């Protein structure tokens, strides 16, 4: 194929999120995952799953895998959107076309991840974050694949799909020009936890210097600290439905600002067309901001799918940095 470059194809989910596939056990056993750079653990719904959410999912059968390596360590995987239960197990994970004995979680209780889990098409979540972000300290997949001379560089890359325009790819091992436009620009991680970097946040006249910015493929929206969100919805003609993170605006609202993130290396912007979600069925020419107030311990912005949809992103483990370039409209 492409020398040392994998390429797990991505497919959009409801035009907001995206999924990719991978397998466990020496007998393949395919699973649709959410490729989450926002987490560092790999879990899959087990045949031992007894919760309703699993009814619709592809399940993992260890007894059918010559590679299965038991463990049984009870484990709870916690996310911002939910919680998933099960236990540790090790088997042959296959991403793209590379396999490797990998440790993961067999989930048997998905009640804490509802209604999200039953309303989605994915089976499990495959973390792509850092070792310190995981549970049961598991070295990342791309790291191991590198530490096992299976790939050239300890880094993966994302080119999110566009529903009826083009699919996408999760390239592992190396960077490919077919995916981007203009020059790449690297920003150093301020910590080896989430793929978190430091940038100045500037929307209208609101500005947050040295804000923590998490590049997260596992987040469907653009997260913004509460205070910032409130000041941001000021002289705008947006409608917040009381007690709902539902902000309605006229898609053509000429007051809608453009997010501006900057460092001494570059300037990344996100215009309304990138963070607006069409809501035509609710009302004609109507849109919702797909932005949300979320306060972390330290002022943080989660650059979710909206950002990554406009910006081709490189996640370098070896250089501990994030590459950012404009994505090609088409392939």
């Amino acid at each position: 194929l492409g020398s040392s470059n994998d390429n797990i194809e991505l497919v959009d989910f409801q035009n907001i999120m995206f999924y990719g596939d991978a397998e466990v056990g020496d007998n393949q056993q395919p699973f649709t995952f959410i490729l989450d750079t926002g987490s560092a653990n790999l879990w899959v719904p087990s045949v031992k799953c007894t919760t309703a959410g699993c009814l619709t999912k592809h399940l993992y059968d260890s007894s059918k895998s010559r590679t299965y390596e038991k463990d049984g360590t009870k484990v709870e995987m916690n996310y911002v959107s939910g919680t998933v239960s099960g236990f540790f197990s090790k088997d042959l994970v296959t991403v793209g076309n590379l396999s490797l004995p990998y440790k993961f979680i067999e989930v048997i209780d998905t009640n804490g991840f509802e209604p999200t889990y039953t309303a989605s098409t994915f089976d499990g979540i495959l973390g792509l974050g850092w070792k310190d972000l995981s549970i049961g300290s598991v070295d990342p997949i791309v790291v191991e694949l590198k530490n096992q001379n299976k790939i050239e560089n300890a880094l993966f890359t994302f080119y999110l799909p566009v529903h009826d325009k083009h699919t996408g790819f999760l390239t592992i091992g190396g960077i490919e020009e077919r995916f981007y436009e203009g020059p790449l620009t690297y920003e150093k991680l301020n910590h080896d936890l989430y793929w978190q970097i430091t940038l100045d946040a500037h929307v209208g006249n609101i500005s947050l210097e040295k804000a923590n910015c998490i590049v997260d493929s596992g987040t469907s929206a653009i997260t913004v600290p509460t205070d910032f969100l409130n000041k941001m919805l000021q002289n705008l003609d947006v409608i917040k439905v009381p007690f709902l993170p539902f902000y309605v605006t006229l898609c053509n609202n000429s007051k809608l600002p453009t997010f501006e993130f900057t460092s001494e290396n570059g300037k990344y912007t996100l215009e309304p067309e990138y963070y607006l979600q069409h809501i035509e069925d609710v009302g004609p020419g109507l849109c919702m901001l797909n932005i949300i107030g979320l306060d972390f311990p330290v002022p943080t912005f989660i650059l979710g799918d909206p950002f990554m949809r406009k910006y081709f992103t490189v996640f370098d483990y070896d250089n501990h940095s994030v590459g950012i370039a404009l994505a090609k409209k088409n392939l």
Binding site: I34, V80, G129, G218, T219
Partner: peptide, 6 residues
């Protein structure tokens, strides 16, 4: 929405 780890 969906916000992926604690």
């Amino acid at each position: 929405x969906v916000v992926x780890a604690x």
